[PDB]
Amino acid sequence: MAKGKYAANILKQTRKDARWKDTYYGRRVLGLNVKADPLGGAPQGRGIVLEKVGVEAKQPNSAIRKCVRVQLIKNGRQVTAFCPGDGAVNFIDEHDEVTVEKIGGRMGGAMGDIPGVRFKVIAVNNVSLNQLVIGRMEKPRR
Amino acid sequence: MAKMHTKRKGKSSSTRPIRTDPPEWCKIGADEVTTIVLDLWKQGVSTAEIGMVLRDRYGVPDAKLITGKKVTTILKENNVAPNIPEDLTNLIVKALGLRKHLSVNKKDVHNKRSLNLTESKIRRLVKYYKQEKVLPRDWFYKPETAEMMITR
Amino acid sequence: VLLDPLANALSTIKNAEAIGKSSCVVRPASKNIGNVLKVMQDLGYIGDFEFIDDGKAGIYSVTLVGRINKCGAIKPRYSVGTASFERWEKQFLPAKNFGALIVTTSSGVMSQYEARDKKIGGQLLAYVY
RNA sequence: GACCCUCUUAAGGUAGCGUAGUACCUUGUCGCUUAAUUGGCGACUUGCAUGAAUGGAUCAAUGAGAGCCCUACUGU
């Protein structure tokens, strides 16, 4: 932050160091987001459902949130996936092929009163779980 | 402004008036003042108080106004100047005395800092003078060997 | 240490305008200071100015006629061409044909309107309005 | 099993270390080592019967000291 005429180098250096204090630019250049998330920048995924858990909600609210436990096939990463909609666990069971996607909440992380769950189901056996929840599609016997 | 190593600013300047001419109320001449300067220099009196004794006992308002030359200009003209400037010699003399004192009082850290400040002033004077060719390029201020009173 | 006399003079003029003082003294005068004061006088923003020598760099007894709003130096003194004045004008100035930028040029020091008339650019010096 | 009290003829073992060169139960239980190990090392340790100059823990270097393992070697 030198205001002299022949002081572009100092301003460039001090802007270079101060940029790192931002979380977003440093995490982008360091590649923490690619290294961390199971999908690796893939917008959705495909994992084998293993166990189904109706995980509880936050402290003020009170509810049970149906969350399958799914292991990815692209990477073999074990995570937890929240299945939305009424009758959510009715259209999904153990050992399925289900597309998964990020829950799209706070900072890309877990959304709402669901603690510790960041992934959500979007389709079971390559068909839309939203339409199964609505009632315009039927669960394949596969 | 603030001082060199203490930030205590001060304004005890010696207010010299706007005089573009020599005195009109004094009968002193350029030859008289230059003879007085040379005699006082040969006595062993430094240039800071040569002008002071000119201005006090002879009432000489300024040597440059009358003679057209300052004290050191007259010194260089007559080959009656030292090889080292008086400010650098004074700083080196004070530093040598302070080092002599500090070689027996090793707890006197405040005067160690005072010695460091005077060393900084000495290196500043040497850098300015080597910038302006008063002193040789290869003669660096050695604080242990090449710092004597008359350097040769 | 004193190391920007033109900016110091314009800051003093800014202070004197802000208090509304008709007159104010200018700390040590310079040739570019006199050129800026002459061009500002021809702009009508500043009334009068005299170099009163003091056996020193010299000072000014400037009579502020109450016509300006703020005036400081341009740091850095940017190089400017004939096709590069409008961005500085949009930055410093408040409005089109309102206030002028003091420019230093090989022809002479002058506001950028007359520099654009001259078709010669150079270094920005200051701004007054 | 982090508390009121004990058992208190002075005191109730602190730091550490712990199946030890000390540990009866005992070839204690778990991991590495092996096809297989009453062994070696690491960890746990309710310590029959550890513990601070009755010195405690730990230690580079040194050792014809005492165990175990790998490679090389070989009529062991």
Added chain:
RNA sequence: GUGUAGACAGCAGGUCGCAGUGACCAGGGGGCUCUAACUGUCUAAUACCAACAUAGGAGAUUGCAAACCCGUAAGGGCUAG
């Protein structure tokens, strides 16, 4: 090439054998623990050790006609301290 010199160091090419420190001479190496710090000393004739000693640490007595010790005594060691 260095050196005064003895000698030492180095380079190019050729060539033999299974093998060129050709015999003699001449460390096998490494990792993890226990124990003692180390060099040293030790049961001459079954124990060369982890034992003894060691520097280091700490404690105690004594101001010299002392503390400690020898002698029956004369008088002595420590102490030409």
Added chain:
RNA sequence: GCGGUGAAUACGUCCCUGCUCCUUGCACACACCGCCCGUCAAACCACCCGAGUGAGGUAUGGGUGAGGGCACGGACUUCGUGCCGUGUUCGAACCUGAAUUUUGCAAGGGGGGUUAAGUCGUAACAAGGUAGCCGUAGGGGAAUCUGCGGCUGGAUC
């Protein structure tokens, strides 16, 4: 509700207990029945150390070393981009010690977080009941405690 009879005490102060008002303090707003810290255990999650135990990359010396290229020598043929040999040259592949780097597993240990209607205290918030915070050192189940300097970001004097 009424009547008979008939007494001590206090010519009060706000100390006790409620309560009212102005000011100061406040981490309190469901307003002190407030908020609130740490250990301990239990469930779960992510992580770190871990004696160990693998896998992969880069580079390095070295090794064994396919194949090819020129040199030279020797023979067979249509007298050689052939053959044998030799020397030289480039050299893949594989093996190996260190170096470097990326990650899987691991008995056990660690602190972090988060969920009970957990247990234990009450450390801070008012002068939070011993003012607190800061550095440092010691002690204790745990908040924390004491000592030293410092500050006031502390009320009342």
Added chain:
RNA sequence: UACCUACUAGCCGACAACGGGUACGGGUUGUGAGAGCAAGAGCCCGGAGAUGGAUUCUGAGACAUGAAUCCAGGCCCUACGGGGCGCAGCAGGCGCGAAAACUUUACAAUGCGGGAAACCGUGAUAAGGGGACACCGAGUGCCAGCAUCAUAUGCUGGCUGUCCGGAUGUGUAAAAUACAUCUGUUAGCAAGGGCCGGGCAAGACCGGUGCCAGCCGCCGCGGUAACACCGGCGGCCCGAGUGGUGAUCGUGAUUAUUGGGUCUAAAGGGUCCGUAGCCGGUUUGGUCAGUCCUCCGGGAAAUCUGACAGCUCAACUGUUAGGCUUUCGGGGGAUACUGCCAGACUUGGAACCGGGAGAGGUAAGAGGUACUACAGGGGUAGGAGUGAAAUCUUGUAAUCCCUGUGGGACCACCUGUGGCGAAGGCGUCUUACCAGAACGGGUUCGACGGUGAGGGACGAAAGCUGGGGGCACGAACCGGAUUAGAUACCCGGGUAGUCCCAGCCGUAAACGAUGCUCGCUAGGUGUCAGGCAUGGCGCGACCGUGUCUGGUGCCGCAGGGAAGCCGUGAAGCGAGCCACCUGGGAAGUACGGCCGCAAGGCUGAAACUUAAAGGAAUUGGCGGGGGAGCACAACAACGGGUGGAGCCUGCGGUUUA
């Protein structure tokens, strides 16, 4: 040096070498008002690669995508003696995954090699097929009259063919679309997608469910009246599109040169000295390198902008005027500006002298009082301490008093909203040594200056190492109380330590929570040093008021801040340099590194978790703050009784249909 030889001892790097991470480079693309910021798959330019790797033939040219050779690696045809192959060429297949087409057509054109030519080949190219690629253009309706609940199907009236189907020709290599006439339609075949509590445009309409099902980017909903959630009803926005999750730009001046903050919210480094860097006084003389105007060589097209021309409008192709390409090489003019050259100038800093000020520093010594140790004299039942106690201490005579001799620490009042010091910090006195300051100065110097990442010294207290000392104080420790407990506050002992001598660590709320330098900006107001006028003063050593300069405090206008506030001693207005912060935890933690004897200091993440944390201010409640006041649901002073005994009734719980 590409290799070899003799020789020299260099070369690159702290202005980032070497290494790690990542990546085909640019033309450009994304986005924004712009400065910028982010990516550079496709079209063109250059680069490299052919399973990984090495080697080689052929040729003008290769280490060849349709050449070989061998090794690794996988696969393959065999009559088992052997022989091939690698689609990062075009379609296609397996695998892979969130992740993408036809094994169509033709040399007709544009190119290329071949030929002398005629011409042949061409998965180059063109032509299509398929894929909610990007853009652009259209339509599913139109429509008079008439009716309710104001736009829905009505009743009716006709009318058009952009679409869809057909005919026919233009047409292309031949297709197809497109294209023209005709004509097929009861205008019927051709609309969906999200969402409805807020942010945000849309329903406080009716049943369901009951902290459950669910919603929810965030906020927030539901444990009984859900505009919130499910169907409905209705409504809303968009439009052959419409959403979701990343990403990325903008939002966001949330990376800030433009353009941010850093007293109390995250953030000034403990102070300071100081290199590279960076910033720099007025001034004469000379140059013209940055700079400036201009010229000439460039900066491929493509994409960008506008128009014209031509595709029906459109995007699109050509011409053209601009843009980008940039921020190159070289000439002429100018000399303000800055950098270069040589002086000067006195104010900035530097140097010297004068009378004064100062708990400024080291070194030495002496001193003040208290305390304490022992001893002596007197005296005799307790002293000490507490909220109250006890330990403790005392009959071995303490406490208290008197005398005397040693001891170590400690420097009171004086003392100040005083002073000196870089900060830390410094209070007995004397002396020696040293240093800075302000003040006075027709004194010497001539810009010699500011700041300053790295780096260096100083650095409170605690702690550590070695030697001393130990009166007092006093972590630990022990004991006595307090309490439910007390490992605490209280009290009795008291070790290390505080002190000194020689070193180390290097941190504090090291604070003014305000880095340092300069100019500038109303005032009123203590006091301190110096200087200076004057009145008094034993008209002297001295003390008063005024005034300039430099400090040291309070008050406060303008100014600014979110405010508390700051306010010539800025947090005001400009100049310069540096340090520092970028939502709250995890965390000043882990790993690596340096530093230290150690404790530790320095550097410093990530996973994960979370919607706030936080700052000033304010209205109340509240306190074991303060002040004021009041009342037998307070107190004092009183009188009685309930509580005791029996009965009566009411509440709880046992029983109970």
